[PDB]
């Protein structure tokens, strides 16, 4: 697959293959440069290149593992901000399983787990490295991804409202009010808790959420 030229030359052809988008051969050459020169001065650089080379070509689980390897072996390094950003972006894109839905399929409630991992890891980034060049992109992603979580929880609260698991409904929507209340999905979800409380007949409780959502008509 790959020659054992001097490490600077193997790196030069890795660099070039990535810029060419020769992603498969690039990944094989980065893997060979790692294995043949795992402790050398390029090891950190090689780990970052591996992370990108898995993330592009959409080898997402391997990217997530290379990110883990980087943080585990190099918990201090000037571009750890990039590694946590890639933890974020990997877990985020790990929801967007394919393009076939583009003409209307709402994916927001398929699975929370990787969205929630992406959020908490972007949270570590944005809180720890606010001076990063990534920080704005991280924040915009966080806002979207947080509303996406809120949409998933709202989808659960909708389902339970249609089953009438009214304790389940109130407990879910109170969960959304504790966690990420500042979301459009929650602002739409509160009527559904008002209904849940009133179907559960606790009108003296329900009127509080009614007054909250009425005061959030604007």
């Amino acid at each position: 697959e790959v020659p054992d030229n001097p490490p600077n030359e193997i790196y030069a052809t890795a660099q070039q293959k990535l810029q060419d988008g020769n992603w498969r051969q690039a990944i094989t050459q980065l893997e060979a440069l790692d294995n043949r020169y795992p402790f050398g001065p390029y090891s950190q650089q090689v780990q970052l290149d591996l992370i990108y080379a898995y993330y592009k070509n959409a080898d997402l689980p391997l990217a997530q593992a290379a990110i883990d390897r980087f943080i585990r072996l190099n918990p201090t390094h000037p571009n750890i901000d990039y590694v946590m950003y890639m933890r974020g972006l990997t877990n985020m894109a790990l929801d967007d399983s394919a393009l076939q839905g583009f003409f209307g399929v709402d994916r927001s409630d398929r699975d929370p787990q990787h969205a929630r991992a992406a959020f908490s890891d972007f949270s570590k980034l944005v809180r720890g490295y606010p001076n990063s060049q990534y920080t704005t992109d991280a924040t915009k992603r966080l806002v979207f991804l947080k509303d996406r979580l809120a949409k998933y929880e709202y989808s659960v609260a909708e389902y339970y409202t249609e089953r009438g698991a009214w304790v389940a409904v109130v407990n879910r929507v109170e969960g959304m009010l504790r966690d990420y209340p500042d979301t459009q999905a929650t602002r739409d979800a509160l009527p559904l808790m008002e209904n849940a409380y009133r179907q559960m007949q606790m009108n003296a409780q329900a009127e509080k959420v009614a007054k909250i959502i009425a005061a959030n008509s604007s």
Partner: protein
């Protein structure tokens, strides 16, 4: 609306047998109530020091039974008010 179909016996909230209920007394602090009934599966989001218990069952398409049991506390979390209602009916 409703039809004869196997709605799967949905439980909701908490179990309220009489021997569990009569553990409550107004002197209780929340740390005690939490083992009298088990922890409250419902609580006020809106910041009253209040706990809500429902034992609710729906044994199918027919029959619904519910105890509401509302506990409200002094802000210290020491109980002050108890209300038990078997549910009303209406649509």
């Amino acid at each position: 609306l409703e039809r004869v179909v196997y709605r799967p016996d949905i439980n909701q909230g908490n179990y309220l047998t009489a021997n569990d209920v009569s553990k409550i007394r107004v002197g209780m602090t929340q740390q005690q109530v939490a083992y009298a009934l088990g922890t409250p599966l419902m609580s006020d989001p809106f910041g009253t020091n209040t706990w809500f218990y429902v034992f609710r069952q729906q044994p199918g398409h027919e029959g619904v039974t519910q105890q509401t049991l509302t506990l409200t506390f002094n802000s210290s979390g020491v109980l002050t008010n108890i209300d038990n209602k078997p549910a009303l009916s209406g649509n």
